[PDB]
């Protein structure tokens, strides 16, 4: 499940 937005390298 998605918690937030993902920013930057994974």
């Amino acid at each position, epitope marked *: 499940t998605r918690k*937030s*937005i993902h920013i*930057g390298p994974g």
Partner: antibody, heavy 113, light 113 residues
């Protein structure tokens, strides 16, 4: 690895329009947060929504966009933004981004009669 | 979630240091999901800092971010003519209690040479 948006156009108020974000040098079979961001002429950046291309495949939207716009993964190298009921408030350059890190050059939408 | 960015503009000399602030109406996700961008006219945003203080690969170390929770600052050391641009902060938030993201309104940086 790069992104390119297309489908920007001049449209009448009330219209619908679909933009496409095309991936090059990689594919959406891996896990990324693919998001759309817009910018009205002379104004600031505004988040529209995202689609995860990994497990969960979650779509999420800004409250203002929710229910009026959709974002979906349409092939291993394309993500779309479908817009409905357009008004002058929607006139802007539309960018897509991968994890807010890789960005396209943007595509322009003008809503006017 | 509202991310208030100040000042809206600033003019500063080549060789000075310059600081921008961002204040959030609620804690960002994990207290550090916060990023800073640079945007020049006609171009897409460029990621400079993520996770409040981590430098994106290939970004000069005279760019620095700090802060946590709801209060964040961004500082450019040894300002150069090349830095003249608009800068933005972006917050990532808990999706279950509001919108997933919000941009600050931007700071225009003018550089005196």
């Amino acid at each position: 690895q790069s992104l390119e948006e297309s489908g920007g156009d001049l449209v009448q108020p009330g219209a619908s329009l679909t933009l496409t974000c095309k991936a090059s040098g990689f594919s959406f079979g891996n896990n990324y947060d693919m998001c759309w961001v817009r910018q009205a002429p002379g104004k600031g950046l505004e988040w529209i929504g995202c689609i995860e291309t990994g497990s969960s495949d979650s779509a999420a939207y800004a409250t203002w966009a929710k229910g009026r716009f959709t974002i979906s993964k349409t092939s291993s190298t394309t993500v779309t933004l479908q817009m409905t009921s357009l008004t002058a408030a929607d006139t802007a350059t539309y960018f897509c981004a991968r994890n807010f890190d890789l960005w396209g050059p943007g595509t322009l939408v003008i809503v006017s009669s | 979630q509202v991310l208030t960015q100040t000042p809206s503009s600033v003019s500063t000399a080549v060789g000075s240091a310059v600081t921008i602030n961002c204040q959030s109406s609620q804690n960002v996700y994990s207290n550090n999901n916060l990023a800073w961008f640079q945007q020049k006219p006609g171009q897409p945003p460029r990621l400079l800092i993520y996770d409040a203080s981590k430098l994106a690969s290939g970004v000069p170390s005279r760019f620095k971010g700090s802060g946590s929770g709801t209060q964040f600052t961004f500082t450019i050391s040894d300002v150069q003519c090349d830095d003249a641009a608009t800068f933005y902060c972006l917050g990532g938030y808990d999706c279950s209690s509001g919108d997933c993201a919000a941009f600050g309104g931007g700071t225009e940086v003018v550089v005196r040479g």
